[PDB]
Amino acid sequence: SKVPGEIAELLRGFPDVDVQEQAFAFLTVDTGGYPHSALLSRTELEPSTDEAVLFAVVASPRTRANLRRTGTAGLIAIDGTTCHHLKLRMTGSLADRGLLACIFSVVDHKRDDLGIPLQPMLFRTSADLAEQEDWPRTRDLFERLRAGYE
């Protein structure tokens, strides 16, 4: 399987500052079988060059724990009139202190088009946000993961 092309297009690349960006719901499953969520952005999600896998850099401690337990995840991505629902299986990972760089294979993709414009969850990037989230460190871990995968 592969990362759907419409989704690779929404996730590829890394945001500039002072621009609205989509916040993507990144879903996991907790110890009690309840759905769990965290919001990620293009800074933390990146398709492989061959688009076969989706890379993620996850800081959230509870999300990391869930991935390490079940290896299952999901993603919600909005574009135009379509709500994309992805199901993901973690096939590999690399830990760096409080960060988990993950490789995911897509297990399912549902395109839910209600035929009406949908606005994604949105936030504005900033220099302070780039500083608080340590954007350069995330970018380095991505390079290490891509090298290992390639």
Closest distance to its own copies from the beta carbon of 3 (Å):
16
Q: Is 39 in the site for Na ion (CB under 5 A)?
A: yes
The enclosing H or E element of 23 equals: none
| Residue 120 contact, options its own copies, Na ion, none, Cβ 5-8 Å cut-off depending on partner type | its own copies
Q: Is 10 in the site for its own copies (CB under 8 A)?
A: no
Nearer to Na ion, 46 or 100 (CB): 46
DSSP assignment letter at 12: S
Backbone angles phi, psi at 112, to 5 degrees: -100, 95
Closest distance to its own copies from the beta carbon of 116 (Å):
6
The enclosing H or E element of 63 equals: helix 61-70
Segment 90-96 long-range contacts (CB within 8 Å, at least 24 positions apart): 91/53, 92/148, 92/149, 93/67, 93/68, 94/141, 94/144, 94/145, 94/148, 96/141, 96/144
| Residue 42 contact, options its own copies, Na ion, none, Cβ 5-8 Å cut-off depending on partner type | Na ion
Q: Which stretch binds its own copies (CB under 8 A): 3-11, 21-29, 49-57, 93-101?
A: 21-29
Of 146, 140, 129, which is closest to residue 39 (Cα–Cα)?
A: 129
| Residue 121 contact, options its own copies, Na ion, none, Cβ 5-8 Å cut-off depending on partner type | its own copies
Applying CB under 8 A, the site for its own copies has a residue count of 41
- Whole-angstrom Cα distance, residue 47 to residue 55? 6
Summarize as ranges the residues that interact with Na ion (CB under 5 A).
11, 39, 42, 46
Summarize as ranges the residues that interact with its own copies (CB under 8 A).
23, 25, 27-30, 32-39, 70, 72-74, 76, 78, 83, 85, 87-89, 107-108, 112, 114, 116-124, 126, 128-129
